[model samples]
Target: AAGVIPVGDSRVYGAVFDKGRKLTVNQWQAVLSMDAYPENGTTNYQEVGPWRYCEVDYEAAQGISDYRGDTFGPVGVTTVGDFPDYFKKAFAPYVLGKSNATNADMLAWGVQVTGVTAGNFQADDTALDPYPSKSRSDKNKRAALTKICGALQSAFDTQQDKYVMSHYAHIDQDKLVPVLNALKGIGFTAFDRYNLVGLAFQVQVNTGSIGSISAFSSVKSAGNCGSLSAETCFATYLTDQYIRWLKSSSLGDDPDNCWRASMALDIYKKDPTMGSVSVVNQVINASYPGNSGKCPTSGIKWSKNMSWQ
Candidate 1:
């Protein structure tokens, strides 16, 4: 009977009943192939599903965007900010009534909501201009920069749990100081710094590798530090060979750096038998244009040894 069930696409993979069947949330656990009851009637953090974990972080991002108003500067043509809430809202219509949606759908909606035809959320030339440059006076510029940097620091420190669920378990509080200070030292704007750190945190969690901020600090040092702007350095770190190998052989044109990570986690939820390599391959093949057969065999092999479990 289990073999008779269709599998592959996430929407159909774990369907325990036909459409219109009414089932409570806990009943879906049976469809998902996990234990239906708490082993000892007490919740275990280690037993939490990866999909649920990802959702927690995703919702947290939405909450942060709502509270912060998703803007970085005085309201004007020159103002720049990310609209995570808007992106989520645009996605709601597409996923409505669907058991599950693909990362491709999420990415397409992000482009539509952001109106970023270039296929990504990264800042464009227009947005790259320093906030200080737009200010009317020296005093105003300094004040704006200071406020921005303060926001960045506060988010990094206070929102650590949202970035990586195991952040407290795996990271040392002392190590973060140097990494945060180093980014500030490079004169990166608040928005750029926040974006970089956020991407790094996503990468770390998706790859199932836990490391100290010191480790990130070391990588930052190895990168062409002063020679390149902090934004460029962090972007390089994100697209570097190792990160590419860890996530997938190719970075899809989705433009949202988190797309691949989210895709992999969704795939893992749909088919736990599919290793990380297969998950990454499925994501790339399904979401990326012209990405078929592009994944490197070596990278896939490496991915097989790594586990998000």
Candidate 2:
């Protein structure tokens, strides 16, 4: 995105008033040439012709503050010493020497500082539990999910023009529908390219919680509609016919099973129509599997080995 335009170089004039009034151009040229002619002996290099020197200073300051670590100096204060100032700064921190003495050294420091700024700028501080005292309690789960949703909404709102909108909902079909319908009511549509949908899956197996294997095992156990554990009327009836329906509902075009991959072995029951006996075997084949590891998950094992395993 950076662009440059060339402006040609210019010339300068020098003045002296010691002669009568002043020497005319032709007379000055003659006097100077005569003074430079070295009789017949040798040439005087100093007086031979015009001499030019280009000077560069390393410590000149730029006018704007580098709050975002986007600019680095000596090039009229606006031009950076490197490209993509943020990327340059991130790598520079480890390379700068004490006093940041060299232009190159200052560039390195600026790059690193800018990188740190970017990292801090993009971090999700709200992901960490703000109320640890509620852990394992229903309030804790709700709080965790709420905090995550709030963080996501904040990010989505900020990126809406650049990216898309995003949100969260409970796992039950009836609940998820009304939530999505509410969004649609607010002008959210798939074609807009301005919105995204997300769901949270509680991963504990057979915890007897809504969406849990034990909770969803019996049709009688289906809780209140829109509650997390409740089975859709379509899924409960269709599981006897098509096994795939057991893992998901015959709902609208939106992603099935509330549009997320979770521990399905315990949450879904096998359908008589399914060729396989184990729901796990079938769900595994039906689901998209991947991992998004938690941050800070890997580092040096300080107490053990020197090299990483």
Candidate 3:
């Protein structure tokens, strides 16, 4: 396997959702409402927008949002939604040698390399060194994620909740994303958001916050449950570590930081409640039975039916 790419390597490359343009979440909304999926040969903010809303300076590489590499993507991709196959397809070579590993493994490796949401697509870096050279847990983390998240993806696509969660652990990936979306008021696949929280479960386990990977599942009732809802757990416990990692590198937060804004956008994606959206947020009513510090108690129109959503 290849070593991790150094962020300083001048040869780094990135292809963004929108090239040569930057927009805040507000600007993105303006652009989207005006002309979404234009057939008139104009730009589409829906398909391509900036990461500033997400607090990711795409120009920066992984690990630290400060010291970085190029973020412009490859040739001929029309919109950001197209990155899924492109990233996974090109990323496969790095992990396939890992004894039955598939191509999507490379996507995990790149995002894991810097362990930052800003570090998702370092295309040039992958051509050189792509695996985690930091800790044994890093590589082990990749395998575990591909196994758990990938299986969750299969369950989601196949709509099989009961079968796979039992196969892995009490941790239910099937229910996970919907819970996240409930808080986000948006819908994203387990795979798309996989990179952001990729290192979180491991961190939780090491901290003894979470027992293990299989323990990652959430079994909760909206009112009667004694624990934080799954989404709030992610916002605080998981995203908090992610925020800490980013802030350690100067990715500051002020209640409405990019990460929070990103979740705000997630909620807005579903509800789009005019002017009611708040990038400003905080955790409240925390530390339930068998849980941690602060947890997600509420959000814009927060509601849930299953353990995840």
Clashes of each: 1, 7, 15
Given candidate 3, what's the lDDT at residue 272? 32
Stretch of 10 with least lDDT, candidate 1: 34-43
- The TM-scores of all predictions, comma-separated, are 0.23, 0.15, 0.24
Superposed by TM-score, candidate 2 places the C-alpha of residue 90 at a distance from the truth, in angstroms, of 23
Off by over 4 Å in 3: 1-44, 47-70, 74-125, 128-225, 250-309
Which candidate number maximizes lDDT? 1
Residue-wise C-alpha lDDT for candidate 2, range 1-309, written one tens digit per residue: 211110110110111111121223322222222212211111121221111111112122333222211121111111222222212222122222133234444334333433322222222211122233333234533443344334323332444211110000011121223333433442333311111111111111111121222222233333222332222322232222122222333412112232222322222333211212243233433442231111111121112111100
Instruction: Pick out the ten consecutive residues of candidate 2 with the lowest summed lDDT.
Output: 4-13
Instruction: Give the Å error, residue 146, model 3.
Output: 34
Candidate 1 pairs with clashing backbones: 120-255
Ordered from best to worst lDDT, the candidate numbers read: 1, 3, 2
- Global lDDT scores for all candidate models: 0.31, 0.23, 0.28
lDDT of 3 by residue, 64-89 (tens): 43322122211221112222332343
